[PDB]
């Protein structure tokens, strides 16, 4: 329970959501939003829709977007890894799905224990992710630049791109 020491996202790996493990450096030179999501919520059409915007017109010029399913806000992801891929589908995502986890608690996923940590990842009232859709803005170093709430909406990232791409 090394992640504390972590300098990078880069040093860290996840499962995607058909069960590989990726190592994260693969993002190293791309701008990165990595994402909560959820199938169930209030937010997830606004969500959905604008992120694969961003990334259909931010892609070629390196914008990655990494979402990690999460049930712990109001059990919203209640479904399989099979079923979540099928409902981003649905919305015609092309960036990168990862299996179901937790963010918070002690057995959250490694990448979201160090995120939470970081200088501009601190939260209001305390570091916990409050809810789906938490968003973290990571740069080509894999370092975190900026955290948004779960009511801001990807949109709002737009206009923070260009100090980073």
Known sequence: ?????????????????????????????????????????????????????????????????????????GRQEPG?????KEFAAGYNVKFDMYSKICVNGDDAHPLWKWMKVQPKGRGMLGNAIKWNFTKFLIDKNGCVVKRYGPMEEPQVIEKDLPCYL
């Open 80 to 84: 399989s890894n099979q079923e979540i």
């Open 1 to 73: 329970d090394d992640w504390r020491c972590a300098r990078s996202m880069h040093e860290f790996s996840a499962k995607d959501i058909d069960g590989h493990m990726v190592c994260l450096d693969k993002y190293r030179g791309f701008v990165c939003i990595v994402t909560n999501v959820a199938s169930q919520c209030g937010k997830t059409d606004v969500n959905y829709t604008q992120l694969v915007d961003l990334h259909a017109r931010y892609a070629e010029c390196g914008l990655r977007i990494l979402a990690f399913p999460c049930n712990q806000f």
